Amino acid sequence: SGAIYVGNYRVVNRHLATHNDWANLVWEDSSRDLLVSSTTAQGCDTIARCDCQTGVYYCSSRRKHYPVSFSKPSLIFVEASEYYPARYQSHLMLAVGHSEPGDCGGILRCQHGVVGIVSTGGNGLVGFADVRDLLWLDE
Ligand SMILES: COc1ccccc1[C@@H](OC)C(=O)N1CCC[C@H](C(N)=O)C1
Numbered sequence: 845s846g847a848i849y850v851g852n853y854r855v856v857n858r859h860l861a862t863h864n865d866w867a868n869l870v871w872e873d874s875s876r877d878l879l880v881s882s883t884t885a886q887g888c889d890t891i892a893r894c895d896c897q898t899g900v901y902y903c904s905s906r907r908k909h910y911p912v913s914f915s916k917p918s919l920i921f922v923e924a925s926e927y928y929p930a931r932y933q934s935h936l937m938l939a940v941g942h943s944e945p946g947d948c949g950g951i952l953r954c955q956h957g958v959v960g961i962v963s964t965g966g967n968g969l970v971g972f973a974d975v976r977d978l979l980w981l982d983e
Pocket residue numbers: 859877922925926927928933943944945946947948963964965966967
């Protein structure tokens with residue numbers, strides 16, 4: 845679990861969004877595993893606007909942060925799960941690192957701010973849904 849809070853928006857994994865997230869829906873994209881809902885309280889986070897390929901992410905299944913080198917956002921095949929059919933997930937960045945069910949929502953950050961959130965795992969890999977292209981989150 846986990847979310848990004850920026851301005852009057854909350855960014856979560858689409859497959860973990862709550863009834864309240866859906867009742868206050870701003871935008872969602874099943875192909876990216878993202879959903880953004882509106883909030884009344886002002887958010888605590890700032891979004892990176894950069895091309896960094898190194899950063900640090902929080903891994904809840906280890907209660908630790910790990911440094912990673914990750915690929916540029918791209919279209920990557922993801923195996924079927926209880927949440928999605930087998931499909932290509934877009935705007936996804938892969939890295940070598942630990943991730944298991946329960947780790948989705950952990951934040952990936954670089955020196956400029958929030959880059960994205962954990963969205964895929966297994967096989968000693970961790971995949972992050974990029975949010976750096978969502979410029980409207982900042983206004
Ligand atoms: C049960 O899923 C897993 C199985 C083995 C290892 C890892 C997972 C789980 O790692 C977080 C994962 O990758 N996904 C489940 C949730 C939806 C994710 C997606 N389609 O963006 C895919």
